[PDB]
Ligand binder design. Structure first.
Ligand SMILES: *[C@@H]1O[C@H](CO)[C@@H](O)[C@H](O)[C@H]1NC(C)=O
Ligand SMILES: *[C@@H]1O[C@H](CO)[C@@H](O)[C@H](O)[C@H]1NC(C)=O
Ligand SMILES: [K+]
Ligand SMILES: [K+]
Length: 321
């Protein structure tokens, strides 16, 4: 039994993975990325972001995004399209522009209409707005927030809904799994979009963790239910469990338990629709280039060989290992 087979047997829509264009020349890697027993869903890690899709104002480039979309379509995998609005990976014409509310609003809507229209009908989900919150649940400053104010959030959701009524529109963020101030502010963003009369269908919980900081399965279920209570779906969108190198048998076992708890929380929760890992092999993980001294965060090692966490994920989906 593979991870996606295990997931669908427990009522999830998918088990899936992010990938990135540079990795697709690695044939042993793509062979496993194309293994639909394990991966029912793909996220483009970078090539649908604003710097990749609109590198100058009004000029759209989809070649690299379409490689990932076409690979998912070729495999019959779902696509999570990622991400329209975010402080990071913006081109300089957005960050350095001389904007007014009106002109940046128009440029925002035009970006979203062009990208969402291009992929219309291809995207199970869109991450429409990514990481709009500071750690304390205030709004993260970015040029949209300083120019348009918090209205940029419902504006973005309304523009995506108009261009592709069939895509489920997500708000995506990290550290919501702890509850507290940041999760409360994520629920406030859901209510802001509903108050504005705009569509929002989901909250994405990225599930970037350091090993040993994942709470109990029941704690996670409670937090997921705090979002499904609002009438949105949830999903774990970018899961990884980073270890301060070097690894030991103890931290590999804790990593397995941590992944196991995360996927079982999704299995238990009505309205948690799926689970995505942020790539699948340590060879291509973002973690070392982001979290200094950390690594080995994923269920396959840098030689594409299963780690204990692969069986932890299966155990969290009720499979006898
Ligand atoms: C992976 O699947 C895609 C989509 O069907 C296909 O284009 C590609 O050739 C496959 N690659 C390998 C190594 O199987
Ligand atoms: C920008 O315009 C929208 C639409 O009127 C409005 O909701 C929002 O509050 C404005 N923001 C600022 C900072 O003026
Ligand atoms: K579920
Ligand atoms: K990568």
């Amino acid at each position: 039994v593979g991870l996606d087979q295990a997931a669908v047997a427990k009522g999830l829509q998918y088990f899936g993975t992010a990938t990135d264009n540079p990795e697709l020349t690695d044939i042993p890697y793509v062979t496993q990325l194309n293994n639909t027993a394990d991966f029912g869903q793909i996220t483009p890690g970078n090539s649908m972001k604003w710097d990749a899709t609109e590198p100058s104002q009004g000029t759209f480039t989809f070649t690299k995004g379409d490689v990932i979309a076409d690979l998912a379509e070729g495999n019959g995998q779902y696509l999570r399209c990622h991400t329209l609005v975010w402080y990071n990976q913006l081109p300089s014409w957005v960050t350095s522009g001389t904007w007014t509310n009106a002109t940046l609003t128009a440029a925002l809507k035009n970006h979203i209409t062009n990208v969402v229209s291009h992929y219309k009908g291809k995207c199970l989900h869109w991450d429409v707005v990514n990481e709009a919150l500071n750690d304390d649940g205030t709004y993260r400053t970015n040029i949209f927030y300083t120019t348009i104010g918090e209205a940029y959030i419902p504006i973005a959701f309304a523009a995506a809904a108009a261009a592709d009524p069939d895509a489920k529109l997500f708000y995506n963020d990290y550290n919501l799994e702890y509850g507290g101030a940041k999760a409360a502010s994520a629920r406030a963003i859901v209510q802001l979009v509903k108050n504005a009369g705009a569509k929002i269908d989901g909250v994405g919980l990225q599930a970037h963790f350091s090993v040993g900081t994942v709470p109990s399965t029941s704690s996670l279920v409670s937090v997921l239910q705090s979002f499904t209570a609002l009438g949105v779906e949830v999903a774990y969108t970018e899961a990884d469990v980073r270890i301060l190198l070097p690894t030991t048998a103890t931290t590999l076992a804790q990593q397995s338990s941590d992944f196991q708890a995360l996927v079982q929380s999704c299995v238990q929760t009505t309205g948690c629709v799926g689970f995505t890992i942020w790539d699948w092999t340590d060879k291509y993980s973002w973690v070392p280039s982001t979290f200094s001294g950390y690594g080995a965060a994923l269920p396959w090692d840098e030689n594409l060989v299963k780690k204990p966490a692969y069986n932890g994920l299966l155990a969290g989906m009720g499979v006898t290992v």
